[PDB]
Design a protein around this ligand. Sequence first.
Ligand SMILES: CC(C)(COP(=O)(O)OP(=O)(O)OC[C@H]1O[C@@H](n2cnc3c(N)ncnc32)[C@H](O)[C@@H]1OP(=O)(O)O)[C@@H](O)C(=O)NCCC(=O)NCCS
Ligand SMILES: CC(C)(COP(=O)(O)OP(=O)(O)OC[C@H]1O[C@@H](n2cnc3c(N)ncnc32)[C@H](O)[C@@H]1OP(=O)(O)O)[C@@H](O)C(=O)NCCC(=O)NCCS
Ligand SMILES: O=C([O-])CC(=O)C(=O)O
Ligand SMILES: O=C([O-])CC(=O)C(=O)O
Lengths: 449, 448
Amino acid sequence: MKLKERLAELIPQWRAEVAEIRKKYGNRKTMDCTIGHAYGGMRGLKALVCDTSEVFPDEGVKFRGYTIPELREGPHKLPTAEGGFEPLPEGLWYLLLTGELPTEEDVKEISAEFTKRMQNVPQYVFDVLRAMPVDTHPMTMFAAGILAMQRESVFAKRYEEGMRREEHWEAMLEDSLNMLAALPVIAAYIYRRKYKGDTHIAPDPNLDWSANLAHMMGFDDFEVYELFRLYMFLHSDHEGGNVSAHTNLLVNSAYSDIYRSFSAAMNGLAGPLHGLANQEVLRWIQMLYKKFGGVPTKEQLERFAWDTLNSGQVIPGYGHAVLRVTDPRYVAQRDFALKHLPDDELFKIVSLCYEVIPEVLKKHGKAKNPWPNVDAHSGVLLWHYGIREYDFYTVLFGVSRALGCTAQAILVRGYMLPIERPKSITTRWVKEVAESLPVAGSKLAAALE
Amino acid sequence: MKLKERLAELIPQWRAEVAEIRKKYGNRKTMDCTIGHAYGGMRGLKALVCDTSEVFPDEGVKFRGYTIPELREGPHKLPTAEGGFEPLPEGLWYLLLTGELPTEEDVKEISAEFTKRMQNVPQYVFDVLRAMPVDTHPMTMFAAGILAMQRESVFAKRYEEGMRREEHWEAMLEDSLNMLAALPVIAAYIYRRKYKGDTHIAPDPNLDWSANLAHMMGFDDFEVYELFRLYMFLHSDHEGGNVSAHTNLLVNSAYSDIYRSFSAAMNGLAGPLHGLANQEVLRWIQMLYKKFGGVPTKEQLERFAWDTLNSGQVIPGYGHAVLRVTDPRYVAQRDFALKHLPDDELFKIVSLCYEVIPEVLKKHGKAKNPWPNVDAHSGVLLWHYGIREYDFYTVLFGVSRALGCTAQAILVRGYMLPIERPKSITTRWVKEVAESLPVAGSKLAAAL
Ligand SMILES: CC(C)(COP(=O)(O)OP(=O)(O)OC[C@H]1O[C@@H](n2cnc3c(N)ncnc32)[C@H](O)[C@@H]1OP(=O)(O)O)[C@@H](O)C(=O)NCCC(=O)NCCS
Ligand SMILES: CC(C)(COP(=O)(O)OP(=O)(O)OC[C@H]1O[C@@H](n2cnc3c(N)ncnc32)[C@H](O)[C@@H]1OP(=O)(O)O)[C@@H](O)C(=O)NCCC(=O)NCCS
Ligand SMILES: O=C([O-])CC(=O)C(=O)O
Ligand SMILES: O=C([O-])CC(=O)C(=O)O
């Protein structure tokens, strides 16, 4: 497989480069660490490495240095399905791993690997899934199904047999191919059992990875296939620092295989502070529709927005802290909606918010960002095509985020980064010593530097 | 429950104190963050809070300010079982949660809570365990059974219904009691199904928590109950920064319940670099025994150690990522062994290592820490009493570590700390700006 031969050349080089960097720049200061970081969830602390993606405040997320527009339409467009427009996640995965753009044949090899492997989900995984009570939350089922498949881990098997550190990335890759192929099968099983009367649809060996998820959930529509391709592409990766990506890296750092690291990550994604944002946006849009007996006018939405902001509250999906521009993942979703469901009533509200809410936020004066993120837009797209089971939205997010998690996990085992092991501090120590400590950026801090 | 009444007073104060510290001292600097931290797994970076325990590089772990000798032997001896010497882990949990030494009655109340709730493991958790192929690694089975029981989460349910942030710690405590009571039942189930012919032994309502695990595994000797009590005490907690404790805090930070956060932690503990050291040491000890037809002499062992290091190998059970002297968890185990199995051949090798190996690792000069850690001593104790299933040793570790993880998760939810969300950097950026950055503790750093 091309992906593998290429990595066999790039990874030895990256490994050497990283060893040199740690040697010659290890002592370079990036910032001050504060009491505030320790009690404030490490916010802003430059404590991890991720090379798959990178957020620029003035551009949004890039994938190995390419913008979403370059990959989606521009001059570096990734391969699509036959007759499709939307980029295939398979090709994006090639890019995240290698840092190089795939050829059509590269993508097809990855698609065939996925299609083949998607037939290899162990029967006992479904036994595990069926032993869980059907009212179990779908993210609990998703994580459990993944973890049960740890029995099939090549990394775990090869590690116990004795393999060189240099082979770690090979085993991580094999495991990632198996796990990624399995994810849509597990996800669809959960969907069909909980919400569609426990009737089950087999993978179509002539569909790509994203489309097969839609197929197996029971949604056979070209538009739905295209939405799922775009959705999986957009949500694939967002740096290393979010709870689920970080959980993945942390468990990975102890040499736990991808079934263990990624199921752990899904337990983090299942958290209400990490995995529900898209659902909350959608329920808000729906609350506006019902409040206004239909699409609100520009004046009604303005007033409702002022009422919300003046009463200390925020508007879901808008005004997050980092970007100074619209999330490029939002823009691609809007472009999809304009093309494919412009008259859908909930979309009309999301569209009006894109006009109105940024104008209101500029005027209100708090947010150095008046613009939306990805979660502002995704829910109405799912809901339009009949995917209405809110709890399950987090599972779709999880399937997508597996692309970036698997890439990250393969790369860091290629780099041979060590176990993650920060130092914790006690409140006792803090209370004793805090007076003694300089204010960060102060003249005293400069003195004690 | 005394525990909960005590928390119902202490947590509101601690919460207020933490809000004060964040407002007043948030901007105080503790150290420089470097490029090396980001590529070096955050080693030394003061990035997390943990009030349950603290590891002093030059003294070892203290639990809420108490040393292991203080709590096991010394002037602050925790409660023991009737006729026992070893401290009950139930009282250690009380200490971790409250910061106060428990009475006998406090401990009995926690024991009874575990006893009662041990009868309440859902039938479907066993169905989940039986659906996994019996040759599945035991730590995969353990994590999966814990995760399946997430359906019974009171935190999840109350959060969905709408609860005030101040009720968090209470739902975490209820969940922790349930989960802790379930862990020995799940662990024993795994043990019996994999290794003892799939015959199952019910919990004993009159045993304490540790003893009940031993009983349900099929061991009823007093000395084994005492070993389990000591083992569960020693492995209970070791700051917030180790992979399992940290994974628990990270997932808990997103408001995921203890079944999710602790099952995530167990997937980390299952990793070779976190949870395998016990077994590696025992196999190494057994390799020596077989190599020398018995206990080696000082000179044989000395020579072996040198040959080992100069052949590029590591001596298992020596060194630590933070510890810098003899692990007091090692010393407690040695004491148990001198008392209870002084003539055990494998123990005699462990003992001899204690005399010889430090000297060697010092002169070799690569190990930052030349002394034994907890893992140098645990395997020979288990092995002596007939617990021989190497892979399962990590599950025993996990059951113990749940005591620290649950204490930490309750506390951090009481304090109301936010979501853990550091910043990742790229190699591209490092290459672009590294030369222009100041060296940590330099003149240019001072100017900037
Ligand atoms: C003020 C602002 C600029 C920063 O947001 P933030 O609240 O610091 O964001 P986080 O999600 O990282 O942290 C949430 C914190 O808000 C706290 N918070 C929210 N409302 C609160 C209230 N009424 N009282 C106390 N704390 C409150 C939470 O409890 C949590 O803990 P902390 O205050 O102890 O730190 C905000 O307007 C904003 O833009 N937030 C979005 C930023 C963001 O994280 N974007 C996501 C990018 S993917
Ligand atoms: C625990 C351990 C992983 C910590 O590693 P660490 O923090 O990187 O250790 P140090 O800072 O002392 O490493 C410095 C050097 O000493 C070596 N070293 C450390 N402990 C050693 C040991 N017991 N035997 C041989 N060499 C050892 C390291 O390999 C390293 O050499 P290198 O720079 O060529 O790689 C390590 O001491 C070890 O491998 N111990 C054996 C297994 C074990 O008992 N683990 C349980 C830990 S609770
Ligand atoms: O997962 C996400 O949406 C991104 C995120 O929270 C972060 O970078 O902290
Ligand atoms: O603390 C560590 O780094 C590893 C360890 O000893 C433990 O978790 O008990």
